[PDB]
Short mmCIF file of C-alpha atoms in Angstrom, two decimals:
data_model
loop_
_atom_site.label_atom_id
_atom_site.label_comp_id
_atom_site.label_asym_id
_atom_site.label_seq_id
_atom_site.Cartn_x
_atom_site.Cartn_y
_atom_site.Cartn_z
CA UNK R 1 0.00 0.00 0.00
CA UNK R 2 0.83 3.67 -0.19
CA UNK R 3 2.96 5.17 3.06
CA UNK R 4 1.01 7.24 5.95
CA UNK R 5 1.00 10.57 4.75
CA UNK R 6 -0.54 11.96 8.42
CA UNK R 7 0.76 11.92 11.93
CA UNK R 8 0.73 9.19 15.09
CA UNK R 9 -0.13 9.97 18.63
CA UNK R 10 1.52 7.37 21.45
CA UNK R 11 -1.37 4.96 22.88
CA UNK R 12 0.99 4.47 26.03
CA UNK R 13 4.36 5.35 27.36
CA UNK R 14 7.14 3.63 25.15
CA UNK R 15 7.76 0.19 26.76
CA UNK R 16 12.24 -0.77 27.00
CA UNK R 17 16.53 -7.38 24.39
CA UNK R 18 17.31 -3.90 24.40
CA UNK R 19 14.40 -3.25 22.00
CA UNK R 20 11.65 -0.48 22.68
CA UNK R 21 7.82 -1.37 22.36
CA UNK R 22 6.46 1.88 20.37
CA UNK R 23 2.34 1.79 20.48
CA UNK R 24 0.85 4.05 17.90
CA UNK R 25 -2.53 5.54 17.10
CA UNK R 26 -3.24 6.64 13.00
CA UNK R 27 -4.57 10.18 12.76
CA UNK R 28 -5.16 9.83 9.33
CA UNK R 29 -7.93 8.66 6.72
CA UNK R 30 -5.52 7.23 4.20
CA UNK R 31 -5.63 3.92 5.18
CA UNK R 32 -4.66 0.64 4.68
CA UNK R 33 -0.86 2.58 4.61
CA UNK R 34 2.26 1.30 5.42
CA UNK R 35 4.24 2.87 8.61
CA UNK R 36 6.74 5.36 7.51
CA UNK R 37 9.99 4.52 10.36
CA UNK R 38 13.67 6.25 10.07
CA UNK R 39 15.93 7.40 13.11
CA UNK R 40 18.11 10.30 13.68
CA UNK R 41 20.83 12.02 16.15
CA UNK R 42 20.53 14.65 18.54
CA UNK R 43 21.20 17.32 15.44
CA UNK R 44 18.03 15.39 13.50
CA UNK R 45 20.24 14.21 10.71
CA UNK R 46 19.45 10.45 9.69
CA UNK R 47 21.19 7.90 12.31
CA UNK R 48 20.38 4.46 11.51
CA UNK R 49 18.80 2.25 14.17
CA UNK R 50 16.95 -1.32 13.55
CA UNK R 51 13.14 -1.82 13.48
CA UNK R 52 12.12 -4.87 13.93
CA UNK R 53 8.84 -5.29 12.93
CA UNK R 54 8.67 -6.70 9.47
CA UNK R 55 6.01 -4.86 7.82
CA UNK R 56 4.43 -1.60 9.94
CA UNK R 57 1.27 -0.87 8.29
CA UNK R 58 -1.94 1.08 9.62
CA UNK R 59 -5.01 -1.59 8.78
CA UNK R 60 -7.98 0.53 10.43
CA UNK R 61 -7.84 4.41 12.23
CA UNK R 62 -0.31 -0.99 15.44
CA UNK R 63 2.76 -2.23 18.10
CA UNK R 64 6.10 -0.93 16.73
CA UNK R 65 9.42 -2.92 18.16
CA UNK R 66 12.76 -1.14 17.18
CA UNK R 67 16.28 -1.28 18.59
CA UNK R 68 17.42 2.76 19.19
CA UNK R 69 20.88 3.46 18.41
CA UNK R 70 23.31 3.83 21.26
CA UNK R 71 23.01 7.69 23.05
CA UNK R 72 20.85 10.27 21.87
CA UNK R 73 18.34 9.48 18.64
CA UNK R 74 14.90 10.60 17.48
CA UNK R 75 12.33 8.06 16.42
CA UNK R 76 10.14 8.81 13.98
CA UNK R 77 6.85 7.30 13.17
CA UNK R 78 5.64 9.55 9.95
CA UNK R 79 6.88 12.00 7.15
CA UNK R 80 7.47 16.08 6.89
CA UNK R 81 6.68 18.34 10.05
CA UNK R 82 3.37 16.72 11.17
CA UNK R 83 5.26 13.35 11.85
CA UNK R 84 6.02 12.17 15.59
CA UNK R 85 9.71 12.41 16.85
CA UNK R 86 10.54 10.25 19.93
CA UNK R 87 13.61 11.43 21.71
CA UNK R 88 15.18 9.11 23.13
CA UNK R 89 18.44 8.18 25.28
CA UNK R 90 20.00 4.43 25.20
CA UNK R 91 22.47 3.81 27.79
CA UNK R 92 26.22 2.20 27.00
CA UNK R 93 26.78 -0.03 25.62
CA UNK R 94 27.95 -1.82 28.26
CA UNK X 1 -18.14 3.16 15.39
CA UNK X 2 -15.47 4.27 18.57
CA UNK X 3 -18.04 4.99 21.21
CA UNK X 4 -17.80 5.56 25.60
CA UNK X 5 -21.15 4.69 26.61
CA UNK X 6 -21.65 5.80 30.32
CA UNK X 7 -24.83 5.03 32.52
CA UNK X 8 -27.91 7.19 33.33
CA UNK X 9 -28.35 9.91 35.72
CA UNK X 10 -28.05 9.13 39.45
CA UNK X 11 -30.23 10.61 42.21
CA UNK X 12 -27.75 10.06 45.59
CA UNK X 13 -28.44 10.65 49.28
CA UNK X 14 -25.59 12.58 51.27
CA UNK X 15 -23.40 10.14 53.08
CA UNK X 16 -24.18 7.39 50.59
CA UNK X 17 -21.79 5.60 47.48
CA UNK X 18 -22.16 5.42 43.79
CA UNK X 19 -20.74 3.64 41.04
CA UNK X 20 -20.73 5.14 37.31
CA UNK X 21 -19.81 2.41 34.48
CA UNK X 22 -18.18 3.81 30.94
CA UNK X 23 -18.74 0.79 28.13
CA UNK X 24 -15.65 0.90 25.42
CA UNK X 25 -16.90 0.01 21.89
CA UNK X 26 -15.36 -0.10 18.66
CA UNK X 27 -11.50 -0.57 20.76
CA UNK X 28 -10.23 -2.90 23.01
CA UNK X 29 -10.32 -0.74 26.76
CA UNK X 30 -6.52 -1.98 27.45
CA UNK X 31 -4.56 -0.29 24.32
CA UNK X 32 -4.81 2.98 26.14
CA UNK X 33 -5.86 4.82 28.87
CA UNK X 34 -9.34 6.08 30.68
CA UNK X 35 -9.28 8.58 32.99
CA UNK X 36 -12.22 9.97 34.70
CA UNK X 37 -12.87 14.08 34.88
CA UNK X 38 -15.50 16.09 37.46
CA UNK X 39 -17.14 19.35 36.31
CA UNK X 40 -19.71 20.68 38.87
CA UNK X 41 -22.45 23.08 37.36
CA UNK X 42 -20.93 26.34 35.58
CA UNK X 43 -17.73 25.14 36.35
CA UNK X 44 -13.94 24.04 35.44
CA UNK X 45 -12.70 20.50 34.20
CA UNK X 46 -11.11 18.31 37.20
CA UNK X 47 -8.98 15.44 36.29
CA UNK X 48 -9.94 13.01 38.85
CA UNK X 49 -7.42 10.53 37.86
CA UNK X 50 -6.39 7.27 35.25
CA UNK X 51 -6.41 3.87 34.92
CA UNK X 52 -4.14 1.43 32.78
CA UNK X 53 -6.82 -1.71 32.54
CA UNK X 54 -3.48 -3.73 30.80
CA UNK X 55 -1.92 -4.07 34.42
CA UNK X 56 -4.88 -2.44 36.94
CA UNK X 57 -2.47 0.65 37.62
CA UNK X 58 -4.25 3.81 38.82
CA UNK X 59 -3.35 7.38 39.67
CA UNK X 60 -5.42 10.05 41.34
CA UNK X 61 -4.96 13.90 41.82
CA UNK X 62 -3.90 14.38 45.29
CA UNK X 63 -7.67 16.19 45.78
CA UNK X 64 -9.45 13.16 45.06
CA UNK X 65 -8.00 10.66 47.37
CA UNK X 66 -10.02 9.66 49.56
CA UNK X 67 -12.93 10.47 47.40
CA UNK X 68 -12.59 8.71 44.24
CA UNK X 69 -11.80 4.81 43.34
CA UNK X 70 -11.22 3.78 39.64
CA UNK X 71 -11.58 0.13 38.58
CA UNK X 72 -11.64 -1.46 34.87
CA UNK X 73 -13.40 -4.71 33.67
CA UNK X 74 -11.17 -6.35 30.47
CA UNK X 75 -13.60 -8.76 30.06
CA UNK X 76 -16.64 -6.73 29.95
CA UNK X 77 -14.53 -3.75 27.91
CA UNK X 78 -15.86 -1.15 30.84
CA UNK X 79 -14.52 1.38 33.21
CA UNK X 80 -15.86 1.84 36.56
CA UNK X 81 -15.76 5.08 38.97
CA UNK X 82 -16.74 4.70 42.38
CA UNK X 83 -17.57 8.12 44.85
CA UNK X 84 -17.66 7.55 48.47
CA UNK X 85 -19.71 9.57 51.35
CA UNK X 86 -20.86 11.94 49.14
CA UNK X 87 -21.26 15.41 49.96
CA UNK X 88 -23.49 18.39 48.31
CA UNK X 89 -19.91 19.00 46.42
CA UNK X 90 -20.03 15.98 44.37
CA UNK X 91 -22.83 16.96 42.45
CA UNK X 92 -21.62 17.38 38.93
CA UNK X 93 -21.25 15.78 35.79
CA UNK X 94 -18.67 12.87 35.19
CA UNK X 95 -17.01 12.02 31.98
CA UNK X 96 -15.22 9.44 31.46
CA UNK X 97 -12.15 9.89 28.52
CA UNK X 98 -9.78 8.16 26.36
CA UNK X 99 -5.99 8.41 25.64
CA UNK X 100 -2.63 10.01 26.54
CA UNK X 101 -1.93 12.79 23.99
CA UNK X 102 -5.36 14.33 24.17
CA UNK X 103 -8.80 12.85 25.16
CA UNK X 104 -10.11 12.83 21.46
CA UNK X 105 -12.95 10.59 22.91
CA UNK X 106 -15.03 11.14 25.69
CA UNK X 107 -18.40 9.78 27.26
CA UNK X 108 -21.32 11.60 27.02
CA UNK X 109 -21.17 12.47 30.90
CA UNK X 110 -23.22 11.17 33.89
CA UNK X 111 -25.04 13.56 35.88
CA UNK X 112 -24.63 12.96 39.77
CA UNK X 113 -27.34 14.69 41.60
CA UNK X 114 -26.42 14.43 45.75
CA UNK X 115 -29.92 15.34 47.65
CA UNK X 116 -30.66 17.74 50.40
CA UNK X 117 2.30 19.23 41.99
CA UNK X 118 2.02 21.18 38.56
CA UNK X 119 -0.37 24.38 38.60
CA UNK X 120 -2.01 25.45 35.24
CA UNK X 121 -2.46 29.17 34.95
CA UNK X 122 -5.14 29.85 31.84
CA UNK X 123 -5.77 33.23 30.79
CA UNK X 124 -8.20 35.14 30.29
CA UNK X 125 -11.12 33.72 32.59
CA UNK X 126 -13.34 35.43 29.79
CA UNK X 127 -12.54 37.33 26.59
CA UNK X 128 -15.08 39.11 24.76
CA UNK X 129 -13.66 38.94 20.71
CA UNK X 130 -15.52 40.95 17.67
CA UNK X 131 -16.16 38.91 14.97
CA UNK X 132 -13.59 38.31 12.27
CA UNK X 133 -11.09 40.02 14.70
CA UNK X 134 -8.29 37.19 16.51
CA UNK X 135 -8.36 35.88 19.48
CA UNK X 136 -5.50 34.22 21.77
CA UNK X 137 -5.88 32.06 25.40
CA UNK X 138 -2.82 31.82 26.93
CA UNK X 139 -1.72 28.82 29.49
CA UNK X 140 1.41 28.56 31.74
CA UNK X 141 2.39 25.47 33.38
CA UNK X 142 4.55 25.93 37.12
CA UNK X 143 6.90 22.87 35.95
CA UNK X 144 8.01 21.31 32.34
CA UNK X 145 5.19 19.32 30.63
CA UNK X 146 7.63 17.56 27.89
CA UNK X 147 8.03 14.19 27.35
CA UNK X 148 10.34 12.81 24.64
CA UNK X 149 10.97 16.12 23.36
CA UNK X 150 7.37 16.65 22.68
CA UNK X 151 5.08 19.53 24.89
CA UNK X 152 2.03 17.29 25.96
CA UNK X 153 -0.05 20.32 25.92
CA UNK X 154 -3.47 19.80 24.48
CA UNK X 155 -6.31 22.21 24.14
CA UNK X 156 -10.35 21.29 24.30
CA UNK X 157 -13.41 22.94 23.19
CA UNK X 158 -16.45 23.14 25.43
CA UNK X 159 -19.92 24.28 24.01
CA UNK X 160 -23.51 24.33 25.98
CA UNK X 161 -24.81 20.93 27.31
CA UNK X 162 -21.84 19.16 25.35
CA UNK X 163 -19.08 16.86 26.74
CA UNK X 164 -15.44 19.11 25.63
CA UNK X 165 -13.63 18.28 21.95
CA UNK X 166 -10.39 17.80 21.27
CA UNK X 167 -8.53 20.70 19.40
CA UNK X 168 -4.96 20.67 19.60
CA UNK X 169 -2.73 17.97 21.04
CA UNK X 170 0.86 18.07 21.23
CA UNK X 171 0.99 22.13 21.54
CA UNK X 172 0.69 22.18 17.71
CA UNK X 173 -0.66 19.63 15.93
CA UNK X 174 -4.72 20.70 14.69
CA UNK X 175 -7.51 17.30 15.43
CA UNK X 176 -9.44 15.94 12.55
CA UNK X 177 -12.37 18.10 11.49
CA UNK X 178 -11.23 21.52 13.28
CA UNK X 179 -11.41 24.28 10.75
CA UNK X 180 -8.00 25.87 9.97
CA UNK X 181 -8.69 28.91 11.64
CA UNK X 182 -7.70 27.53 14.94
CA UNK X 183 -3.80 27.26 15.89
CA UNK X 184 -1.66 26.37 18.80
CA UNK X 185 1.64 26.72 19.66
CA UNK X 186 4.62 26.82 22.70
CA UNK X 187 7.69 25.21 24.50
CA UNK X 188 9.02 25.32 27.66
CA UNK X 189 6.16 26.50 30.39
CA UNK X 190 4.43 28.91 28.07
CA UNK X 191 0.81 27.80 25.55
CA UNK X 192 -1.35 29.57 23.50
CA UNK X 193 -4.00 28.58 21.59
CA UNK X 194 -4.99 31.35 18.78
CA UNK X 195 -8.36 31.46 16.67
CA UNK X 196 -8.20 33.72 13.66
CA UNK X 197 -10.34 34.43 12.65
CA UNK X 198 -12.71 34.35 15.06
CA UNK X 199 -16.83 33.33 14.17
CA UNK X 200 -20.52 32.89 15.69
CA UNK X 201 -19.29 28.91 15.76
CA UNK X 202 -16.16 29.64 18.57
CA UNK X 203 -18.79 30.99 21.28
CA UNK X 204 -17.91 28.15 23.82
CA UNK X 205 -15.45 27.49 27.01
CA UNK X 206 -11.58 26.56 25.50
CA UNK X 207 -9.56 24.30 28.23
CA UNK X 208 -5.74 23.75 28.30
CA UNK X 209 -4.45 20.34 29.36
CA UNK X 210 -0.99 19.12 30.36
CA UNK X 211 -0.48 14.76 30.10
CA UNK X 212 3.44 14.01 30.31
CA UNK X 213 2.76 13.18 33.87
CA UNK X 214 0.02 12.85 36.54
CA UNK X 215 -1.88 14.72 37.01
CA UNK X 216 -3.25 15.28 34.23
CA UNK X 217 -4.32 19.03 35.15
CA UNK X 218 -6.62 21.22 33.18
CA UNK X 219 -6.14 24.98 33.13
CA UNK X 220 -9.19 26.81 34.68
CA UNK X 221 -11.14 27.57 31.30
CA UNK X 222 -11.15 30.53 29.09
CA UNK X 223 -15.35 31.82 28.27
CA UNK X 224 -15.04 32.93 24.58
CA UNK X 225 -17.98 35.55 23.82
CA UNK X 226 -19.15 38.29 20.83
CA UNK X 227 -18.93 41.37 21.10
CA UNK X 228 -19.80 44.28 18.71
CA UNK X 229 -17.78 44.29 15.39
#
């Protein structure tokens, strides 16, 4: 399917195999559309994590598993300025 | 479709307990959470407190312990609020409401009839706006309301006999269906939520909200009225 054009809202707080448990709302009316997922640094320039959920995709107005890069990174779940940007801060590695 | 079905109106003597029920359809109850809010007649929005039905966890504001008990049934898809030894001061209208980043659904409300820490600073109380002209509400927080870089600020519309809708959530970002005209931005401690520009439709009660962390305080209301062009 085509990707998410709109923006997520978090269902719950983010849930830390290292891995982080991301649970995401659509806000949209484009779907079925796949997840759009990319990480960056502290400076918002793309950083490359690891999701690990195969396919991300909004059925209906989804649980999103990804490994965060070690320090500071932004998750985001969405394109352009509307999407959602998780800060967040790994510790080590150890 | 997504629906909060809450029970009928309750006719309580002083001294005595009730128990209000909000029925989840359309979602599974345990994906996120239901809290529970308290407006008495003519009044503010009170965040009575939040429940997590995945693992039973609840939290109260400080004011309603004591007071208030929140319960959720997973296999019945319902969340329960329970009042003790009421008092003349519990008579209001409870709502019951879904999420974290803004309550974009609530319950219709159920009207309790009893028989004879973060500080949100909202302003104005009341602003009288001419029509077509802007108008901006303005809400400070005493502490930081961010959470992973994001402002959980969220702003709500109240109109006449109507439970409140969800504007803004996230400082910024505008709800499904709310014209263009309305905008919201800030960082730090400092909100505002502007309408521009401003129509016979925006004649209602605004309400910030703060949700990083309990509680999940409301600011004291803003009464948006028209007044000659």
């Amino acid at each position: 399917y085509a990707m998410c054009l709109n923006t997520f809202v978090l269902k719950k707080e983010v849930s830390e195999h290292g891995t982080i448990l991301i649970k995401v709302e659509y806000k949209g009316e484009d779907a079925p559309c796949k997840i759009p997922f990319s990480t960056e640094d502290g400076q918002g320039k793309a950083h490359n994590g690891r999701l690990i959920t195969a396919n991300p995709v909004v059925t209906k107005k989804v649980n999103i598993e990804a490994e965060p890069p070690f320090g500071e990174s932004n998750i985001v779940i969405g394109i352009g300025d509307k999407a959602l940007k998780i800060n967040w801060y790994r510790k080590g590695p150890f | 479709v997504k629906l909060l079905e809450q029970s009928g109106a309750e006719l309580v003597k002083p001294g005595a307990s009730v128990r209000l029920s909000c029925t989840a359809s359309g979602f599974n109850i345990k994906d996120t959470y239901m809290s529970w809010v308290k407006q008495r007649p003519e009044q503010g929005l009170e965040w009575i407190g939040r429940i997590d039905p995945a693992n039973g966890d609840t939290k109260y504001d400080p004011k309603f312990q004591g007071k208030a008990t929140i319960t959720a049934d997973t296999s019945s898809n319902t969340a329960y609020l329970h009042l003790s030894s009421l008092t003349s001061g519990d008579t209001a209208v409870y709502y019951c409401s879904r999420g974290w980043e803004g309550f974009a659904y609530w319950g219709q409300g159920t009207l309790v009839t009893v028989s004879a820490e973060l500080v949100m600073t909202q302003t104005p109380a009341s602003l009288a706006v001419s029509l077509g002209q802007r108008a901006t509400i303005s809400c400070r927080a005493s502490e930081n309301v961010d959470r992973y870089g994001n402002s959980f600020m969220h702003w709500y519309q109240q109109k006449a006999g109507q439970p409140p809708k969800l504007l803004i959530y996230r400082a910024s970002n505008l709800e499904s269906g709310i014209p263009a005209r309305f905008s919201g931005s800030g960082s730090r401690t400092d909100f505002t939520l502007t309408i521009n520009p401003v129509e016979a439709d925006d004649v209602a009660t605004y309400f910030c909200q703060r949700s990083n962390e309990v509680p999940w305080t409301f600011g004291g209301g803003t009464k948006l009225e028209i007044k000659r062009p």
